[PDB]
Design a protein around this ligand. Structure first.
Ligand code: BCL
Ligand code: BCL
Ligand code: BCL
Ligand code: BCL
Ligand code: BCL
Ligand code: BCL
Ligand code: BCL
Ligand code: BCL
Ligand SMILES: CCCCCCCCCCCCCCCC(=O)OC[C@H](COP(=O)(O)OCCN)OC(=O)CCCCCCCCCCCCCCC
Ligand SMILES: CCCCCCCCO[C@@H]1[C@@H](O)[C@H](O)[C@@H](CO)O[C@H]1O
Ligand SMILES: CCCCCCCCO[C@@H]1[C@@H](O)[C@H](O)[C@@H](CO)O[C@H]1O
Ligand SMILES: CCCCCCCCO[C@@H]1[C@@H](O)[C@H](O)[C@@H](CO)O[C@H]1O
Ligand SMILES: [Mn+2]
Lengths: 10, 306, 286, 38, 47, 32, 50, 50, 39, 38, 50, 39, 39, 50, 39, 50, 39, 39, 50, 38, 50
């Protein structure tokens, strides 16, 4: 869920 | 809902030219890409082209008039010809002879229009594809200093001759003259800030390029897919800069550093140049009252004399 | 394929002993360990010695020997040019020399340390090359040019505002410095470097948190300029331009006291070529 | 369709405006007519 | 007076302090973001 | 001016160009 | 859509565009009247053609 | 969408393009007369050829 | 689809009018032919 | 087709406009004619 | 598509391009006539060859 | 969902107050209006 | 197949002829040998 | 395609290119004649070799 | 196969000849040895 | 393809290339003859070697 | 686990003390109030 | 496989010969030892 | 390929490169002869070594 | 393909050419020999 | 291909490289002989050490 850019995508 | 093929291979005014595309081999070997074209032309790209070439036509015809319509003298003297703004005896008046400032005024107006329409083109083409409008605002920050140099500083000073001439040697001359007129530009503190940001921008560009090329065996330069899941190259770059400096960055916020370091240069430059003549008429004397000038009572001047 | 890793596994996986230059020359690195986040080695001890000594010598020359607590009013100056290339502990410029030497060691040590780290992670040698360009800038300004001129008094003073008085006086002694061709090339490369940095930052930021493909940015950069460079070529161009900017500026400052004395006279040949000399009349001669 | 009407309209309108502005600038700089004089 | 003029504080020392403090804070937040836990490829398999 | 020391210093200034040239040549050779 | 537009101008306009067009033409007419008055007043002040 | 265009100009014009073309030709005809009047008045003011 | 767009023409007209107004005001007021804002 | 009519038309129109402007500028700057004198 | 074009020029023109070409040639002829008249008037004014 | 965070308000207020206080103190010090730290 | 394309040759010849015409006209005009456009 | 082209020049021209080539050569011949006349007239006016 | 293309040699020869002719004409005109184009 | 090219030069030239080469050769010979004549005339006018 | 580490406190204290000692020695030597290192 | 392509050698030799011919001609012309284009 | 090339130079020259090389060497020989004659004539005109 | 031999021969040829040019200009500009004198 | 090249320098030279190297060394020797002759002639003309 947690991603390098700071976005938490499903 | 964006069809990239249609966005690149359409006809009309709202379409592209230079189709079918070409291919340069040495660019493919050195840079990795060799395709040239197609290029979009629209409404904002035809208004920029025509206005730019109107201003260029005016400048080059005035060059020919100064030379005397002699092609050989034109070739000899090309790099030290210039079109200059009206002298100080006129104010901001437009009732100036053509060979004493009218051509400069016309050409500068057309150049203003061309740069504005180019900004519009960048904005609209960013929205036509699916990307954000970040190049447009970077160009706006760059254009702030341009409009201070050519429009606002002469307005606040009260004459057009405070603006640069149109020539190869005339920009260097403008730089020298403007620094000499208002004291010493080395003691302008926003000049110091601008130099800080320019040298930092060059530092950062060299660093980022070198570290991405160094770890390219593991495809670290594909920064679009690295911002979704980081692989061995990005991990190695992070470890390199952590073991060198004690702190590192991401494959995302490094480009944030890049954008802001490049943007601050033009903004600080615009502020410094605008303040240069209107509030502080002498920067060395100001720096002497502000305690930032070293005394130097016994110079060794034998270094500076042949 | 991809999961959440806490970056401790990442750092623990890549730590290995002994692949540096000292490990290849002597067979073992005497300082092959880490302190905190930093990696110490040979050339990490030498660099830190140089750093501490340079800072101490600079501050002793500024606070003592000048009697000022204002950091912007110090003139850390070299010996006079009448002394030649001689060093004397009983003469005013001595501490400047010490500071200069220490800085050199620090800078050179830093460079070599980077190579060591590049060898530990199995990388290329691009960062040492790009940094060695500006280390060579320092060496040209402070070592090669004063030796060719013949005195240590041709080097720059090390004050925060006073090293700019040297730049101003040197630039107006060889008037006009704007007419130096290598100077113009260097300024061109600096401006191009800043433009390229802004363009790359904007391009990568404009596609970050979006449900698009990787081909949108190519279509964008091909609709606006007619050419898109690629992902390996943007970063290659960045590296090359950044290095060349200072590489070309080394020549401009080296050739000033040697081989040249006046950059307005340098162009005196241009109007005297046989193709176009003797073709105008009046103020249009030459 | 080889020729587009919109391109003709845009190009002709822009050229006319540019020429009008240029002629006005030249005549103002000439000083032959009184116009905006002192 | 041994003191600078007020524009010396407004034009020189406040921007200097702001630059230094902003650099420190931006570096702190950059490093905090970069060393956190998020999606990465496994170093053991990927190498 | 010595003119012999100055020439050696000029040669050092020129040899400072070498790593970038080798980088360009390596890029050209390794990408056929 | 294409309901209040006259049959002549259907392939060019819309409903919202027709309303905005009416607003624009009224604004232009008002501005032209104000501009004529301003020019007459300025000429009464100081004639610019001598 | 070709019912207002004459049969000669069908391979070049549309309905919308024909309408805009009519607007353009009327505007050009209007502008030419004003230009002629302006030039005659300016010659009556001060001739530019001597 | 539509050969001409109304929104584009509106934007272009507004920008052109603003630019012309600014240019004419600057040209007229800097000539010195009118008695405007004199100390 | 090897030749496009649109390209030839555009090139001819641009070249005619540029040449007319250039000739006008040279002839006025010559000073031979009594044209727009203060 | 090629009915109006004469047999000789079929490999180069369409109907639309043929119509546009006719417009162009007529405009060029008119311009040449006007240019001849203008040159004669200018020479009557002041000859440029002495 | 709150429009603002309390932490941001606290940090901004503290920073603004500190900068304002330092500036006012140093502006008043170099004016010469008050005796204060006078040799 | 074909060494030269005819279109490129036509374009190059046209541009070269135009450039030479301009160059020779300006050389003869500025030389001052012929009366032409004088005073 | 290569029908109006003579047998010798088949590997270089089409019908369209052959027609354009004929136009070009006619234009060049006319221009050469005009240029010769112009040079003779200018020499009769003022010789440029002395 | 073929080391050179005929098109490249033709282009290079034409460019070299044109540049050489222009250079020699300019040198001769500027020398002043021949009468040629004199006021 | 390589029909009119002599068998000696077949590995180098093609039919179209052979024709273009013949044209170029004839142009060069004519230019050389004209250049020789021009140099003789210029020497007869004023020698450049003394 | 714990908000602060003992090692960081030791390191920071040592660095600060060393820097302060050197700075105070240099300032007191520069002041000239003591007859400390005079020729 | 070959150490040198024939095309590169031909190109380099031609360019070097042309440059050397120009250099020698200009040096000898500038020396003044021969009459050449006097007056 | 390696047909006209002699057995000694097979690994270096192709079939076309041999012919190109022959042309080049003949050109160089002619240029050398012309250069010798030119140098002799210039020495007859004005010796450059005294 | 090894890069040593071609690099060595190229650098040798460049060095020889540059050295020959430099020595010839140095000897010419000295006046020790007659050579090209007015 | 490693033939006619001695085994000592086989890890460095091919056969084509061997031929090129032979040409290079022969050129070097010829140049050295000519340079020696040139220096002897120049010394006979004007000695530079006295
Ligand atoms: C007129 C001035 C006088 C003079 C007046 C004084 C006065 C007054 C003082 C000194 C003190 C000192 N002087 Mg004295 N001194 C003079 C001239 C000299 C000269 C010289 C060549 O002229 C020298 C070499 C010295 C040397 C010294 C040092 C021995 C000492 C500073 C200790 C220190 O560095 O603390 C820093 C050391 C550290 C290791 C940094 C750490 C300290 C911090 C603050 C606490 C953390 C401790 C740490 C956590 C413990 C962990 C263990 C460590 C890792 C080992 N002085 C002249 C003659 N000097 C000071 C002293 O006596 O201290 C004992 C002192 O008060
Ligand atoms: C004697 C010379 C003076 C001096 C006098 C000045 C003066 C005067 C100025 C500077 C300014 C600057 N000086 Mg300074 N400067 C000195 C010595 C230095 C030294 C040095 C090592 O000694 C350095 C590094 C600098 C560096 C700098 C820069 C930081 C800064 C301008 C950078 C910039 O943003 O330009 C980039 C330029 C732009 C962004 C505007 C132009 C481009 C825009 C974007 C529009 C271009 C579009 C174009 C029209 C399209 C046509 C192109 C088509 C493709 C064909 N100066 C000394 C003291 N300097 C400037 C400044 O900012 O002051 C604070 C300034 O005005
Ligand atoms: C009288 C002194 C000067 C002169 C000074 C000016 C000045 C100054 C201006 C003109 C403008 C005009 N002049 Mg004049 N003009 C002169 C001589 C001439 C001569 C001549 C042959 O002598 C001619 C043909 C003209 C013709 C013209 C037109 C091109 C133009 C008419 C305005 C218009 O189109 O309104 C069209 C209708 C509109 C533009 C509607 C406007 C919409 C609203 C009203 C915008 C206003 C902003 C708003 C009120 C701000 C409030 C904010 C709140 C939130 C609401 N002038 C003489 C020499 N002229 C104006 C222009 O160029 O504008 C385009 C202009 O500013
Ligand atoms: C240009 C600024 C505005 C705009 C401002 C106006 C104004 C104002 C009007 C219109 C009107 C119209 N507009 Mg609109 N309109 C715009 C954009 C558009 C677009 C588009 C997709 O871009 C379209 C399709 C239209 C379409 C239309 C039609 C619905 C209508 C045209 C009636 C007609 O038949 O005119 C054909 C007739 C002419 C062209 C008359 C020619 C004008 C004269 C002859 C030339 C100028 C001379 C001068 C005025 C004095 C004349 C005296 C001479 C000596 C004889 N507009 C732009 C955004 N539009 C008209 C309307 O709605 O009224 C019912 C109207 O009054
Ligand atoms: C700017 C040029 C315009 C153009 C303007 C004209 C004009 C005007 C005419 C044509 C005519 C023609 N054009 Mg057109 N035409 C253009 C481009 C083209 C293109 C293209 C591929 O772009 C094509 C295929 C054509 C095709 C054609 C043919 C259908 C037609 C016959 C040509 C001809 O007579 O051949 C044979 C060629 C010649 C006879 C040329 C000889 C003319 C002289 C010799 C030129 C030298 C002038 C010299 C200074 C004075 C001469 C005096 C001497 C003593 C003789 N045009 C461009 C867009 N075209 C003609 C026609 O009748 O249309 C129906 C015609 O009058
Ligand atoms: C006489 C006074 C000057 C002199 C002035 C000039 C000038 C001026 C020129 C020469 C040129 C030449 N001179 Mg000379 N020359 C002088 C003394 C010398 C001496 C000497 C030892 O003194 C030598 C060796 C030469 C040698 C030469 C040759 C290198 C060259 C002629 C051969 C050639 O290649 O062009 C022959 C051309 C060809 C083989 C190609 C054919 C070109 C065709 C004819 C195309 C022409 C374009 C045409 C005008 C366009 C119309 C086309 C239609 C529309 C279809 N000159 C003296 C000092 N010399 C010319 C040159 O350099 O040309 C390259 C040149 O322009
Ligand atoms: C440069 C301008 C035009 C062009 C202008 C002309 C003109 C004009 C003519 C041709 C002619 C021809 N052109 Mg064409 N042609 C062009 C480009 C081409 C291209 C190409 C690959 O692009 C090709 C394949 C051709 C092909 C052809 C042939 C179909 C045709 C006959 C060639 C021939 O037999 O002469 C081979 C013979 C020579 C080359 C000798 C002539 C050169 C002389 C010696 C140069 C000096 C002339 C001077 C008067 C001196 C003469 C006497 C000397 C002292 C000996 N052209 C370009 C686009 N072309 C000719 C024709 O017959 O039309 C149907 C013709 O008259
Ligand atoms: C006589 C006046 C001067 C003097 C003037 C010159 C000049 C001038 C030159 C030399 C050169 C040399 N001199 Mg000396 N020299 C002097 C005194 C000395 C003294 C001394 C102790 O006194 C010494 C040791 C030397 C030593 C040298 C050598 C470094 C060198 C000869 C080696 C060589 O070139 O062959 C090496 C052989 C080769 C490199 C093979 C390459 C040659 C082949 C044949 C190619 C030739 C190019 C040819 C023109 C191309 C034509 C191509 C065809 C048209 C196809 N000189 C005196 C003081 N000297 C030359 C030099 O530096 O050359 C590098 C040189 O040009
Ligand atoms: C002066 C310089 C003298 C030395 C010249 C070396 C040329 C060859 C280098 C090369 O290019 O070596 C090629 C190698 C490897 O190649 P790669 O990493 O591209 O392979 C990539 C495989 N994936 O890189 C290096 O060694 C880097 C060398 C780092 C240091 C260069 C800059 C430092 C010298 C400049 C002077 C600075 C002060 C020095 C101290 C006084
Ligand atoms: C290199 C700087 C610009 C010069 C471009 C022309 C030089 C020769 O460029 C050639 C290309 O034509 C060839 O395609 C590639 C390999 O594909 O190799 C290059 O050397
Ligand atoms: C920035 C310059 C861009 C234009 C370069 C012009 C010369 C390009 O030359 C290239 C060759 O390098 C290449 O080998 C061939 C085959 O693809 O194509 C040509 O266009
Ligand atoms: C709309 C843009 C701002 C317009 C501001 C105009 C400033 C005019 O300023 C002018 C001077 O430029 C002029 O030289 C003298 C003549 O005595 O009169 C002043 O009013
Ligand atoms: Mn990047």
């Amino acid at each position: 869920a947690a991603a390098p850019a700071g976005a938490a995508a499903a | 809902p964006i069809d990239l093929h249609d966005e690149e291979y359409r006809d009309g005014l709202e379409g592209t030219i230079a189709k079918p595309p070409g291919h340069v081999g040495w660019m493919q070997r050195l840079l990795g890409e060799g395709q040239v074209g197609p290029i979009y032309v629209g409404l904002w790209g035809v208004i920029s082209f025509i206005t730019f070439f109107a201003s260029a036509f005016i400048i080059l015809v005035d060059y020919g008039r100064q030379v005397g319509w002699n092609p050989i003298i034109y070739l000899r003297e090309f790099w030290n010809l210039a079109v200059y703004p009206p002298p100080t005896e006129y104010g901001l008046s437009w009732n100036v002879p053509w060979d004493k400032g009218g051509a400069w005024l016309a050409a500068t107006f057309f150049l203003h229009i061309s740069v504005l329409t180019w900004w519009a083109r960048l904005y609209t083409r960013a929205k036509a594809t699916g990307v954000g409008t970040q190049l447009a605002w970077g160009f706006a920050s760059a254009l702030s200093l341009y409009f201070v140099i050519y429009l606002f500083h002469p307005l606040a000073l009260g004459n057009w001759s405070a603006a640069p001439g149109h020539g190869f040697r005339a920009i260097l001359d403008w730089t020298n003259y403007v620094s000499i007129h208002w004291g010493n530009f080395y003691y302008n503190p926003f000049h110091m800030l601008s130099i800080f940001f320019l040298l930092g921008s060059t530092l950062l560009l060299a660093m980022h390029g070198a570290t991405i090329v160094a770890t390219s065996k593991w495809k670290s330069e594909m920064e679009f897919t690295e911002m979704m899941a980081e692989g061995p190259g990005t991990q190695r770059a992070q470890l390199f800069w952590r073991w060198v400096m004690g702190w590192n960055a991401n494959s995302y916020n490094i480009h944030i550093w890049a954008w802001w370091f490049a943007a601050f240069t033009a903004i600080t430059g615009a502020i410094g140049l605008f303040l240069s003549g209107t509030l502080v008429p002498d920067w060395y004397a100001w720096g002497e009252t502000a305690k930032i000038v070293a005394p130097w009572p016994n110079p060794d001047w034998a270094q500076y004399v042949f | 394929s991809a999961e959440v890793i806490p970056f401790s596994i990442i750092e623990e996986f890549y730590k290995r002993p002994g692949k540096t230059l000292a490990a290849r020359f002597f067979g073992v690195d005497p300082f092959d360990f880490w302190i905190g986040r930093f990696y110490v080695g040979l050339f990490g001890a030498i660099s830190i010695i140089g750093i501490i000594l340079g800072v101490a010598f600079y501050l002793y020359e500024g606070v003592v020997n000048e009697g000022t607590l204002n950091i912007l009013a110090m003139r850390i100056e070299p010996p006079p040019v009448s002394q030649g290339l001689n060093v004397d502990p009983a003469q005013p410029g001595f501490f400047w020399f010490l500071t200069m030497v220490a800085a050199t060691i620090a800078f050179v040590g830093w460079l070599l340390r980077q190579i060591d780290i590049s060898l530990k992670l199995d990388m290329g040698m691009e960062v040492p090359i790009a940094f060695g360009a500006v280390v060579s800038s320092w060496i040209t300004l402070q070592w090669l040019r004063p030796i060719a001129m013949g005195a240590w008094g041709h080097g720059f003073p090390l004050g925060i505002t006073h090293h700019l008085d040297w730049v101003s006086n040197i630039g107006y002694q060889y008037y006009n410095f704007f007419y130096n061709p290598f100077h113009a090339i260097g300024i061109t490369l600096l401006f191009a470097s800043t433009l390229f940095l802004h363009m790359h930052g904007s391009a990568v930021l404009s596609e970050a948190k979006r449900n698009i493909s990787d081909q949108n940015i190519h279509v964008f950069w091909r609709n606006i300029l007619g050419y898109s460079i690629g992902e390996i070529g943007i970063h290659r161009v960045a590296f090359w331009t950044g290095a060349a900017s200072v590489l070309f500026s080394n020549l401009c400052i080296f050739l000033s006291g040697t081989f040249v004395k006046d950059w307005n006279a340098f162009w005196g040949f241009w109007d005297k070529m046989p193709i176009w000399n003797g073709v105008g009349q009046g103020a249009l001669v030459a | 369709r080889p020729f587009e009407f919109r391109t003709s309209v845009v190009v002709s309108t822009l050229l006319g405006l540019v020429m009008a502005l240029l002629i006005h600038f030249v005549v103002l700089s000439s000083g032959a007519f009184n116009w905006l004089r002192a | 007076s041994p003191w600078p003029v007020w524009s010396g504080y407004a034009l020189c020392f406040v921007p200097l302090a702001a630059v230094i403090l902003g650099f420190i804070i931006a570096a702190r937040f950059t490093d905090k973001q970069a060393t956190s836990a998020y999606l990465r490829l496994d170093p053991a398999k990927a190498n | 001016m010595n003119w012999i020391v100055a020439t050696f210093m000029l040669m050092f200034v020129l040899v400072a160009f070498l790593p970038l040239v080798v980088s360009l040549a390596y890029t050209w050779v390794t990408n056929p | 859509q294409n309901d209040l537009v006259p049959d002549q101008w259907k392939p060019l306009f819309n409903n919202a565009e027709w309303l905005v067009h009416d607003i624009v033409v009224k604004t232009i007419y008002g501005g032209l009247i104000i501009a004529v008055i301003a020019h007459v007043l300025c000429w009464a002040w100081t004639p610019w053609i001598r």
